[PDB]
């Protein structure tokens, strides 16, 4: 019993983290096979970030200008290219610790683990979600860029995020491992404001199911609702519209608890309208929206 | 910027987890050098747990009855002994992945990372605290026993917890790596109730400092207090008494923010008396007490 905000074990990713230095800029890279992936802004001074022309800045950079260090051993750079907002540094050594891996582009509401790194060294691991406004709420200091977000399916690491940017609102923006930003964000120090950070309704319901499974039941009520009625309330509270696809995804948790999805929607409706009244659910005073239905099933069944 | 509930990178501990089977009981063991550490109740049937005589149960067990599996390779058991509530299984192979390590016994209020395992395989990592009632609020299913809690100082893993027990209240009890339970708990299926789960005051104040550092300042007020006045309020709210030792520990965060510890105590006093009024601090609607002052400084300075 118990339900914690749980990251994937980080060992497979720890084995992939290198230090990348270009001039006075040091950040992190991801070493898979004989390629090191890092944010392209590794080539920028802070002054450059105001209005960088990356193709023009890149012309002044040679393979020997990209200093790549794995532990205390230097990697030889034999080639480099820009793909969207990442650099691919070809090195002469395949990472011997390369795990089975995929590059995946996640959707808003999907959770992932972040291995926060500085100078190619792991500092910690935490669980994030791709927010509906395509930001993430991370913990990232200067030097943390090139830290990656990932899921594990048994032995295969799916890399979904590389850290690039802090908005002035202190939220985070980054790319998939093809270097495409999530959302409308760009690797330039400009006016970029996040849109509405709406609540991931399907994730809250997953977490309410996790609460029932773990004995927290006080919020179960005598009511039901419909998708359309629930959605009128979701709108008002800046919750994502609940779709039949979400209802279908929640089916296994419905089955296990014997609580119809729409009944749990009616519980969530009362919690939105009435508040917690100073009570907690799974030790939280707000509705947690960074567990997916798949996260709940994983943690409640003990998948390794 | 940003402040997350952050675990240590788990790789060094992942490399230590084995499966231990005795009869029909499978749980996890920790393989360091040529010793595998596991809960002694590995020798019990569920029926035994009602009133186990461990010395008597152990007599019926030989080295060849302890099946120890690291990945898909079996380890040869060449000796076994009971130390308090753990078994030490001597194996003929030193774990080649043994990190630098210590066994440390932590105090209530100290945080640690848990690598939740099943069948010697990691499922996830999360951050816990030794509660003032010597429980922890974990996420542990059947099979999770022998999962360990740890801190890392650069390259040295300090093992502070091994998982043994779920109380009927769904909270967790376990031992240090010498097999001594935290608190008054025993490895028997009996009436054991947790005492008052008081809030770790020094940890809340640390986290309020983390909030200021990361831009959340709305709760800063015009007031101060004294340890004695604050403590009258702490008592009423089941918060741990704040000591001068705690004030001293918070000194660096005081220095960095320029907020006197006692001023931050007066902010915490108003928050206790007045509530959050539906506001959040670092995305939390309750006062977080599972960051130590050392955790805050670590995460805010990016230690690896
Ligand atoms: C994203 C990131 O870490 N960027 C950065 C900011 C300031 C200094 N160095 C770096 Cl890298
Ligand atoms: C502590 C733990 O994991 N114990 C347990 C309970 C039920 C079945 N197997 C085990 Cl091991």
How many CB atoms within 10 Å of residue A275?
13
Is the CB of residue B219 less than 8 Å from the CB of residue B171?
no
Mutate which of B19, B20, B24, B25 for ligand 2? The one with the most ligand atoms within 8 Å of its CB, which is B25
Last residue of a domain, one of B80, B99, B118: B99
DSSP states of B242-283? PPHHHHHHTHHHHHHHT--HHHHHHHHHHHHHH--TT--BTT
φ, ψ for residue A62, nearest 5 deg: -110, 160
Residue that is last in its domain, among A156, A182, A197: A197
DSSP string for residues in chain B: ------BPP-HHHHTTEEEEEETTEEEEEEEETTEEEEEGGGG--TTGGGS--HHHHHHT--GGGEEEEETTEEEPEEEEEEETTEEEEEESS--TTPPEEEE--PPTT-EEEEEEEETTEEEEEEEEE--TTS-B-----TT-TT-EEEEEETTEEEEEEEEEEE-TTS-EEEE-TTSPBSTT--SSSS--------B-HHHHHHHHHHHHHTT--TT--S----HHHHHHHHHHTTBPPPPHHHHHHTHHHHHHHT--HHHHHHHHHHHHHH--TT--BTTBSS------HHHHHHHHHT--
For ligand 2, the distance from its centroid to the CA atom of residue B27, given in whole angstroms, is 7
CB-facing half-sphere around the CA of A255: CA atoms within 13 A: 7
**Alpha-carbon distance values, A285 to A234, B94, B169 (Å):** 19, 47, 19
> Same domain for A125 and A208?
no
**Is the Cβ of A171 closer than 8 Å to some Cβ of chain B?**
yes
HSE-up (13 A, CA, CB side) for residue A29 = 33
Inter-residue contact A160 to A112 (CB < 8 Å)? yes
> Is the Cα torsion angle A4, A10, A12, A13 positive or negative in sign?
positive
Q: How far is the CA of A93 from the centre of ligand 1 (A)?
A: 27
Q: Does A241 touch chain B (CB under 8 A)?
A: no
Atom of ligand 2 nearest to the CA of B39: 1
> Do residues B99 and B156 touch, judged by C-beta distance below 8 A?
yes
Supply the CATH number for residue B82's domain.
2.40.10.10
What angle in degrees, to the nearest 10, is found between the helix axes of A201-213 and A293-301?
20
Radius of gyration for the alpha carbons in chain A, expressed in angstroms and rounded: 21
β-pair type (A172-175, B66-70): unpaired
**Considering only CA atoms, which of B39, B43, B171 is closest in space to residue B117?**
B39
Laid out side by side, the sheet with B25-32 consists of B73-75, B66-70, B17-22, B25-32, B35-39, B86-91, B77-83
B161 bridge partner residues: B149
CA neighbor of A89 nearest in space, from A36, A38, A16, A40: A36
Question: Do B10 and B134 lie in a common domain?
Answer: yes
Examine the domain organization and report whether A35 and A82 are in the same domain: yes
How wide is the angle at C-alpha B210 spanned by C-alphas A122 and A106, nearest 5°? Answer: 50
Q: Which of B171, B186, B208, B183 is nearest to B84 (CA)?
A: B186
- Which chain A residue's Cα is nearest to B141? A1
Q: Which B residues in the span 124-153 are in contact with A, Cβ-Cβ below 8 Å?
A: 124-126, 128, 137-141, 143-144
**Phi/psi at A88 (5° precision):** -105, 110
Q: Are B16 and B63 in contact (CB under 8 A)?
A: no
A220: CA distance to ligand 2 center in Å? 29
Contact (CB<8Å) B126/A5 = yes
PDB resolution in Å: 1.7
* Cβ atoms of B45 and B24 closer than 8 Å: yes
Cβ-based contacts of B6 with chain A (< 8 Å):
116, 123-126, 139
Burial label for A30, CB within 10 Å (0-12, 13-18, 19+), is buried
A67 at interface of B, judged by CB pairs closer than 8 A? no
Whether A45 is in the pocket of ligand 1, judged by its Cβ within 6 Å, is no
Distance (Å) from the C-alpha of residue B241 to the closest C-alpha of chain A? Answer: 22
Q: DSSP string of chain A? A: ------BPP-HHHHTTEEEEEETTEEEEEEEETTEEEEEGGGG--TTGGGS--HHHHHHT--GGGEEEEETTEEEPEEEEEEETTEEEEEESS--TTPPEEEE--PPTT-EEEEEEEETTEEEEEEEEE--TTS-B-----TT-TT-EEEEEETTEEEEEEEEEEE-TTS-EEEE-TTSPBSTT--SSSS--------B-HHHHHHHHHHHHHTT--TT--S----HHHHHHHHHHTTBPPPPHHHHHHTHHHHHHHT--HHHHHHHHHHHHHH--TT--BTTBSS------HHHHHHHHHT--
- Does the annotation mark B128 as catalytic? no
Looking from the CA of B25 toward its CB, the CA atoms found within 13 Å total 21
B151 and B244 co-located in one domain? no
Instruction: Please give the angle made by the CA atoms of A77, A81 and A85, to the nearest 5 degrees.
Output: 120
Query: Residues near A271 by Cβ (< 8 Å), separated by ≥ 6?
Result: A219, A287
Distance CA(A229)–CA(A185), nearest Å, equals: 34
What sign for the dihedral angle of Cα A92, A94, A97, A100?
A: positive
One domain for residues A52 and A81: yes
Same domain, B5 and B139: yes
CATH number at residue B204: 1.10.1840.10
> Does the beta-carbon distance from A301 to B141 stay under 8 Å?
yes
Give the residue numbers of A annotated as catalytic, written as ranges: 41, 145
Both A121 and A180 in one domain: the answer is yes
User: Angle between the A261-274 and A227-236 helix axes, to the nearest 10 degrees?
Assistant: 30
B165 CA to centre of own chain: 13
Determine contact: A121 vs chain B, CB below 8 A.
yes
Order of strands, edge to edge, in the sheet holding A73-75?
A73-75, A66-70, A17-22, A25-32, A35-39, A86-91, A77-83
* Same domain? A5 vs A34: no
Say if CB A179 and CB A268 are below 8 A apart. Answer: no
The range of the structural domain enclosing residue B64 comes to: 15-99
- Residues across chain A: 304
CA distances (Å), origin B147, targets A59, A174, B78, B177, B245: 51, 34, 23, 11, 32
Contact assessment for residue A166 and residue A145, using Cβ atoms and an 8 Å cutoff: no
* A25 touches ligand 1 (CB under 6 Å): yes
Q: Verify whether the Cβ–Cβ distance A137 to B2 is below 8 Å.
A: yes
Contact B85, B225 (CB under 8 A): no
The Cα-based distances of A253 to A225, A227, A246, A261 in angstroms read 18, 18, 12, 9
By DSSP bridging, strand A156-166 and strand A148-153 are antiparallel
Cα A202 from Cα A223, distance rounded (Å): 19
Interface test with B, best of A120, A139, A151 (most B CBs within 10 A): A139
Residue B296 CB contacts under 8 Å (≥ 6 apart), including other chains: B3, B206, B207, B209, B210, B213, B253
Q: How far apart are CA A287 and CA B153, in angstroms?
A: 34
Classify B282 in phi/psi space as left (phi over 0), alpha (psi -120 to 50) or beta. left
Experimentally, the structure was elucidated by: X-ray
Of B156, B161, B184, B189, the residue nearest B174 (C-alpha): B161
Judge contact between B268 and B236, C-beta under 8 A.
Answer: no
Which protein residue's CA is at the shortest distance from atom 7 of ligand 2?
B142
Question: Other C-beta atoms within 10 Å of A59: how many?
Answer: 8
Regarding whether A243 and A283 lie in a shared domain, the answer is yes
Q: For residue B294, list chain A residues with Cβ-Cβ distance below 8 A.
A: none
Convert B71-112 into a string of H (helix), E (strand) and C (coil).
CCEEECEEEEEEECCEEEEEECCCCCCCCEEEECCCCCCCEE
Number of domains in chain B: 3
Nearest Cα to Cα of residue A205 among A147, A267, A298, A257: A267
- CB-based contact A22:A66 (threshold 8 Å): yes
CB B253 within 8 A of CB B293: yes
Q: For residue B3, give every residue at least 6 positions away whose Cβ sits within 8 Å of its Cβ, in sequence order, or none.
A: A139, B207, B210, B211, B213, B214, B282, B291, B296, B299, B300
Which positions in chain B touch A276 (Cβ < 8 Å)? 285
The verdict on B7 and B129 lying in the same domain is yes
End-to-end CA separation in angstroms for chain A: 17
- CA gap A145, A187 in Å, rounded: 11
Give the integer Cα–Cα distance in Å for B231 and B236: 9
Residues A135, A246: one domain? no
Residue B273, CA distances (Å) to B76, B109, B203, B209, B268 in order:
60, 23, 18, 19, 9
C-alpha A1/C-alpha B215 separation (Å) is: 35
Calpha distance B250→B199 (Å, rounded):
17
Other C-beta atoms closer than 10 Å to the C-beta of B65 total 14
Nearest of B241, B147, B131, B181 to residue B139 by alpha carbon = B147
> d(Cα A3, Cα B114) in Å, to the nearest integer?
13
Ligand nearest to the CA of B138: 2
Which domain-ending residue is among A64, A99, A134?
Answer: A99
Q: Phi-psi bin for A92: left (phi > 0), alpha (psi -120 to 50), beta?
A: alpha
- Is residue A2 located within the same domain as residue A84? no
């Amino acid at each position: 019993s118990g339900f914690r905000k749980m990251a994937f074990p980080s060992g497979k990713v720890e084995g992939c983290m290198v230090q990348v230095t270009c001039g006075t800029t040091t950040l992190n890279g991801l070493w898979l096979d004989d390629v090191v992936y890092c944010p392209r802004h590794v080539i920028c001074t802070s002054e450059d970030m105001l209005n960088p022309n990356y193709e023009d800045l890149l012309i002044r950079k040679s393979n020997h200008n990209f200093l790549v260090q794995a532990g205390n051993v230097q990697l030889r750079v034999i080639g480099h290219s820009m793909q969207n907002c990442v650099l691919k540094l070809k090195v002469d050594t395949a990472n011997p610790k390369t795990p089975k891996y995929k590059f995946v582009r996640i959707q808003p509401g999907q959770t992932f683990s972040v291995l926060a790194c500085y100078n190619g060294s792991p500092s910690g691991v935490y669980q994030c979600a791709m927010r509906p406004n395509f930001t993430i709420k991370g913990s990232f200091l200067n030097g943390s860029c090139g830290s990656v977000g990932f899921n594990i399916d048994y032995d295969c690491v799916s890399f979904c995020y590389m850290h690039h940017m802090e908005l002035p609102t202190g939220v985070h923006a980054g790319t998939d491992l093809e270097g495409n930003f999530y959302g409308p964000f760009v690797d330039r120090q400009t006016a970029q404001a996040a849109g509405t950070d709406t609540t991931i309704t399907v994730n809250v319901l997953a977490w309410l199911y996790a609460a029932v499974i773990n004995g927290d039941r006080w919020f179960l009520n005598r009511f039901t609702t419909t998708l359309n009625d629930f959605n009128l309330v979701a709108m008002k509270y800046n919750y994502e519209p609940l779709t039949q696809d979400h209802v279908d995804i929640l089916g296994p948790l419905s089955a296990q608890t014997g609580i119809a999805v729409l009944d749990m929607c009616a519980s969530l409706k009362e919690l939105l309208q009435n508040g917690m009244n100073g009570r907690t659910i799974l030790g939280s005073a707000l509705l947690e929206d960074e567990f997916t239905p798949f996260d709940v099933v994983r943690q409640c069944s003990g998948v390794t």
